[PDB]
Structures are given as structure tokens and as C-alpha cells.
């Protein structure tokens, strides 16, 4: 018997169809505990303690984990993040200069904490000029509803909840264009990969297979009602928000997976870690993270 705990997150993306269909468990034969995490920092800790064996991490929590020598490897990309992650603010905040003195929430060292710091740097605003507070996305929604924060840089379901009444000031497609792109990845603990390599391959296969029908023709994929309802259920968003969210990233073919895992992801971690060091969020970094990426499961 193989038991595996998988830490998943709430982005609405096509591989959620494979999760809702239980395809990984069916094809691998493992008993799979899918555990929902509110952001990536807590996933890094659960991977480090051995409580989780496969986890979905943003590129910023990934660089923190790799700088702390957590024994995990990226074995699959989930998505290249675009405007599915966004800074949503009170409507009276009209320009980036209006963020000065405001209370802006982000989950600690998430991709949106990272993107917020990169956006402030791009705008010429020191992070000390903004009251950046650390809250998990459910608490962000609650604080926003009570008017205790002025905005947040968030992903689904918080991003669409806040946008119902707020205004988008920037998003991670823009921040990517400015030179700080962010990614979502899947990582695996080494000891699990050593013992159950065919289960890890089955995970990658299930996720990659599920994204290819979307890549081939987004509009045809999005008009299959069961695709929309499965993502709405697992992300916790209204069905009407799913197409805009799914189109807010790009996804990879199998050829693109192998290409990105053979160099570009390493370079992504190096650059992400460097910026986090400059921003004071990690004490030490490395000039190479090839121990933390592999193409051998795709
Ligand atoms: N993976 C997701 O669904 C949200 N994007 C990354 C969040 S974090 O950086 O891991 O906190």
C-alpha cells in the first residue's frame, strides 16, 4: 500500500479536472489524501516535516524552501502566472502613489508578496512606505469585508471576491513584463521519489494530460460544462468567474515541460531567490539550484 498526501491550492486551472476526477489515485493505485492549503509557506513547512510528499508551490515559496535546503524537487510546472493574480484595492486608490500609507495584505512570501514587492520597486516606492500585512486569503476576504485593509495582492478565490467591489491596480502579467515573472510548480520530497517513482510519474502524467485539451483549444475546453463546474467547485469560485481565471495563465505542452525543467526553472529559482535576498526575506542564496529541479518524471 502507498499512502501519499498532496498539498493543493485554490487557483482555477485545467488540471483541477484531473483532481476532481481522482485520476492520479486511479492511475497510480495509491490512496491519496488531497489537503487544501491556503498559501505556500505552510506547504513548505509540511513538506519539510514529511507531513506532505507532493505539493503545489508558487515560485517564491519554492525559492525560500530551496534556500533552506528542504529536500524537494520541482518535477512539473503548473502554470506561468498572469492576471489570475492581481493587486485589488479600494476604489479611491487610483494611482500607485496612493498606496503610500495604506494597509495592503499578502500571504507571507507567496508569489503575490513577491509580486507586490517587485511592483513597488518598479513604481519607485519603498516597501516601508506601505503597511504590508501578512494574512492568509480567507482572513484577507474577511478583513476586506470589514474595511480593515485597503487592498491585497491575491489569487482565487480572494482575487475575484475583492474585485467585486474593488479595482485592479496591477497584476502578475504586468509584473512579469516588468521582469519579475512568477510560476506555480509541483514539488516532491526526495525520499518519496526514491521509494515510489512510478507514483510520481503518474502524478505528472495526470496533470499534464489534463492541461493539453485546454492548450489545444481554450474556447472548446471552456464550453464543456463539466470542465467549468469542477474548477468552480475546487477553487470555490462562481462558475461565471472560471473562464477569466483560467485564461489568466498560460500552460505547458509536454515538450515545453521538458524544456523548462532543463534550465529555465533553475534560472527562475536563482533570480527569485536573489530578489528575495535583496528585499530582506531570505538570509542566504545560491548561484545554482539544479538540485531542486528535475525532468526525469515527465
Ligand atoms: N498555487 C496557487 O494556487 C497560488 N499561487 C501561488 C501561491 S504561493 O506562492 O504558493 O503562496
Author numbering: 22 to 319
Could you give the paper's own sentences about this structure?
We also investigated if larger compounds such as the N-(2-acetamido)-2-aminoethanesulfonic acid (ACES) analogue, that has an acetamido group after the ethylamine group of taurine, and 2-(N-morpholino)ethanesulfonate (MES), that contains a morpholino group, could bind to TauA; we measured an apparent affinity of 7.4 µM and 2.8 µM, respectively. In light of the binding data, we co-crystallized TauA with 2-AEP, ACES and MES and collected X-ray data at 1.62 Å, 1.5 Å and 1.55 Å resolution, respectively. Inspection of electron density maps revealed electron density for 2-AEP, ACES and MES. The ACES with its longer acetamido group displays similar interactions as the taurine complex but its amine group is making additional hydrogen bonds to Asp84, whereas Asp84 in the taurine complex is bound to a water molecule, and its acetamido group is stabilized by hydrogen bonds between the side chain of Asn55 and the main chain amine of Ser10. In the taurine complex, the site occupied by the acetamido group is hydrated. The crystal structures of TauA with 2-AEP and ACES appear to be in ‘disagreement’ with the ITC data since the structures show that these molecules have formed more hydrogen bonds relative to taurine, they display much weaker affinities. Our structures show that upon ligand binding some waters have to be displaced to accommodate the larger alkanesulfonates such as ACES and MES. We also propose that desolvation of the binding site, loss of water molecules, contributes to the lower affinity for ACES and MES over taurine, although they display more hydrogen bonds than taurine.
